[PDB]
Design a protein around this ligand. Structure first.
Ligand SMILES: [Cl-]
Ligand SMILES: [Cl-]
Ligand SMILES: [Cl-]
Ligand SMILES: [Cl-]
Ligand code: NI
Ligand code: NI
Ligand code: NI
Lengths: 33, 33, 33
């Protein structure tokens, strides 16, 4: 059960992480547009 | 070895998200040249 | 104990990866200014 809990918690964190940084990049694009 | 293998599969996953984000940053960078 | 260790190693890499990308993004923000 726990290893399956782990797999779930990681894919999710990785998704937020990816998006958290992509936003920093999106603001830069809008700015220097 | 089963959990170790799991570590390597997730590690492979982060290096890819890392590189995938860097490319979006490299695109803008290439434009800013 | 092997699951706990795998978490530590995964959280560390995710933490580093994030900042290593933000540091690259900051270099680009400097090229713009
Ligand atoms: Cl650090
Ligand atoms: Cl640091
Ligand atoms: Cl660092
Ligand atoms: Cl820093
Ligand atoms: Ni530090
Ligand atoms: Ni830093
Ligand atoms: Ni550092």
């Amino acid at each position: 059960a726990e290893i399956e809990q782990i797999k779930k918690e990681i894919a999710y964190l990785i998704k937020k992480i990816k998006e958290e940084i992509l936003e920093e990049i999106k603001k830069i694009k809008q700015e220097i547009a």
